[PDB]
Design a protein around this ligand. Structure first.
Ligand SMILES: OC[C@H]1O[C@H](Oc2c[nH]c3ccc(Br)c(Cl)c23)[C@@H](O)[C@@H](O)[C@@H]1O
Ligand SMILES: OC[C@H]1O[C@H](Oc2c[nH]c3ccc(Br)c(Cl)c23)[C@@H](O)[C@@H](O)[C@@H]1O
Ligand SMILES: OC[C@H]1O[C@H](Oc2c[nH]c3ccc(Br)c(Cl)c23)[C@@H](O)[C@@H](O)[C@@H]1O
Ligand SMILES: OC[C@H]1O[C@H](Oc2c[nH]c3ccc(Br)c(Cl)c23)[C@@H](O)[C@@H](O)[C@@H]1O
Ligand SMILES: [Ca+2]
Ligand SMILES: [Ca+2]
Ligand SMILES: [Ca+2]
Ligand SMILES: [Ca+2]
Ligand SMILES: [Mn+2]
Ligand SMILES: [Mn+2]
Ligand SMILES: [Mn+2]
Ligand SMILES: [Mn+2]
Lengths: 237, 237, 237, 237
């Protein structure tokens, strides 16, 4: 199976697999059953922003999800990630719908990884930033239903020609190049990610959510990973 | 008095004011009596590197001090810094000698602060990097004995025309511009700093150390802050 | 007198001091009489963006001023800037009104300077970015009429409590720290600047314009520099 | 055939295909016959640094190649690159030996591309930096003889187990992800690259050189591109 570390923006509470009874953000370490969650007052139809950070000295994975003027939700978890993940990874965004649905629209996405040793000049860094997505994004690996649309946005899940979201959809976008997130001689390894998103829905209880995730480089959408599994895991273990 | 947050590279153990009985790195929150320390196997005559990081989501101030091939020391402390520090600050390096002495030579120094809201474009950022220091550094506020020398290095404490360190010395260097490290509407505030240093000494027990610190913008060397107080505090409370 | 290098967004044609007969952007080297200009179809009431770049290898100062979907104007000039400017400078924005008027509202401003030698790690860099301006910007030197307003914007020229622009106004904002833009041992020196602006006016022929400029560190608004002189020069020579 | 833009550090003068009669740096636009060259006093056995820059406003491709304390060579050429290159590219380093030989050792390599529109936040950016190369660089496409060695350096051309260079060698390293270097709606597109290199040789006239190049994403070493052709072109046209 894949090896998965993820920050989930979980719009739909699946209490039968350990979700809290409200929409939440969570930190997922090799399981959909989040190691840490926080209540998320998500705002359908508003543009939100997520910021995710980690470094190997502090060993604290943190995320904040915000809507201008409305709400800020933070979640953190203490974990040695470079003990969980392989040394080379790909990074990506995932999203799903299930019986219930929502758009999972990514408006922008940026990421920075640094592998330091003894200097101000790092041993390695990778930074990418997209504030719009081209119609043929050659630096993205699109998986499942993920497409880019005429407005330059990344639609992780299926939307109709009029933009209405569809159920039973899964899609992911990985950055094309592998990322060297740890190396035995590194003094410190860090990563930071930001994305902005727009979740719209006609459902009373929209679903299922969006994640930023880090995985083995050959990661692919698991069989049976739809809906509540957010396109990351094959089961709810 | 000034308001001080600092990471100390403390070369001399002053057990009578709460130092551990070995050279150590420490996190100092408004007191020379570190809130957290780690044993530091410091290598006289070798170039070392310090990396310091913090963000307001994780609320964990961490530092790693390293010598290539030799040693790595890490220390962390959980603290809401933007509750300790004013909204505007200056950032700097300090060093001292006392009865015992050492060079406190800074070879390079970089710093980044970010004040984010809802976007990939921050509300504010400041980044500076020096890999050498000019003879008249107009973007530094030099305090006490601090000078720049013919090799382009920053000598925080007094050195002879032949480079031999002198006792009873204190010096600091602040970046000229104030730094906006928090603002009530910020989603996240972060800072990162790196410097490389060279501590040489003919003393069996060199002293006193080097710090990276953050203070009120009008910070100045306190009266009586020499030696064990590292040019940051007026007393050992 | 001051030593001035500037990119002017000149909204008002003063043909009697060498302006073209249309609104224009220009490159100014120690004179309001631009060394190079380009016609600027400026859009009152729309947010524009300016990008300015230079490096000491290419020795070409270039600027592009754009309005989304509407227009793009470019101007360039071949010049050895590090032969014109002192080694230490301050960088800033200026604006004026005269008999005719306009708002000179800066919404965001960023700047990067790099002083390189033999490595990927530079000898020096400075980067700052403002996507909003605080009510008390301690890292800006405000000169003349320049203020920051309740929306977080920088108003270079005087505006009424209702936002109506006033005539006979001059204002500038400098970054607080001096910038080391050349050094004899540098392999390459570069700078880049971006700002976004909003010019509104009830006048048929708004005036006078906005500049990004680089000057001696002790630069101040010259006597008699109002209106057509854009707060940069004491005369039209 | 491939579409090639390159900066060549040409150590061996092949006057029969248009080289100057001395080692030189050159700007190559779809031909090994450089559009612009400069004399290069290359220093065998010393570490050199190359810096390359371009932006679509200035439309000037420039390079500087330097040895600390010894020499600086600059070359520039005015060209609309985004009229020469496809919209998506890969970027890389190449090197060759022929009858004569040299090591073509890359010690570090960094690259930044920016695709801007109306804001401080770009429409796209990609930045990578390597100050050492891992034994299995999963973010590099190694072509021909290129390998990474035990010191963490990139050896573009073949070297013996003792480090002696071999003749008749060609090797290239491309960054894994494609790069979006132009887009019709971009206000400005820019790129910058730096690498440091070490050329050693026992030959009186070492050969053949190192390039930084930009090409169609599916670029590969052309048949017959050895020696004087630097692994970039199939012929000397
Ligand atoms: O899209 C939201 C959810 O829809 C389905 O689960 C249900 C939500 N309400 C229900 C009511 C009945 C049944 Br049976 C199911 Cl399976 C559900 C499943 O597709 C879940 O994986 C998904 O999280
Ligand atoms: O430079 C190292 C130290 O030297 C002095 O303290 C002493 C170190 N060994 C001693 C022995 C005797 C006395 Br009395 C003192 Cl005050 C010291 C003081 O200057 C200390 O502040 C300083 O940390
Ligand atoms: O604000 C626009 C201009 O207004 C004044 O110049 C005039 C513009 N139209 C005029 C008509 C008459 C006279 Br007299 C003047 Cl001085 C002007 C002067 O203040 C100029 O410096 C300025 O560029
Ligand atoms: O490595 C340097 C050069 O060696 C060969 O060319 C020669 C350099 N000196 C010569 C002398 C004779 C002949 Br025949 C050749 Cl082909 C050469 C060829 O391999 C060239 O492509 C290459 O640039
Ligand atoms: Ca769920
Ligand atoms: Ca001590
Ligand atoms: Ca004018
Ligand atoms: Ca040649
Ligand atoms: Mn969940
Ligand atoms: Mn201590
Ligand atoms: Mn003009
Ligand atoms: Mn040549």
């Amino acid at each position: 199976a894949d090896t998965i570390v993820a920050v989930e923006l979980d719009s739909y509470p699946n209490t039968d697999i350990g979700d809290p009874s409200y929409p939440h953000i969570g930190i997922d370490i090799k399981s959909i059953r989040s190691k840490s969650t926080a209540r998320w007052n998500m705002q359908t139809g508003k543009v939100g922003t997520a910021h995710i950070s980690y470094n190997s000295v502090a060993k604290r994975l943190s995320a904040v999800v915000s809507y201008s003027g409305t709400s800020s939700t933070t979640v953190s978890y203490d974990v040695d990630l470079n003990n969980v993940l392989p040394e080379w990874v790909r990074v990506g965004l995932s999203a799903t719908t299930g019986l219930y649905k929502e758009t999972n629209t990514i408006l922008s996405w940026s990421f920075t990884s640094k592998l330091k040793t003894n200097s101000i000049a790092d041993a390695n860094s990778l930074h990418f930033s997209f504030s719009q997505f081209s119609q043929n994004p050659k630096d993205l690996i699109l998986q499942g239903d993920a497409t880019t649309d005429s407005d330059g946005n990344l639609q992780l899940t299926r939307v109709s020609s009029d933009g209405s979201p569809q159920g039973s959809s899964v899609g992911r976008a990985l950055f094309y190049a592998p990322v060297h997130i740890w190396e035995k001689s590194a003094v410190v390894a860090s990563f930071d990610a930001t994305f902005t998103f727009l979740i719209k829905s006609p459902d009373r209880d929209p679903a299922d959510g969006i994640t930023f995730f880090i995985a083995n480089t050959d990661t692919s959408i698991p069989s049976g990973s739809g809906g509540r599994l957010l396109g990351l895991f094959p089961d709810a273990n």
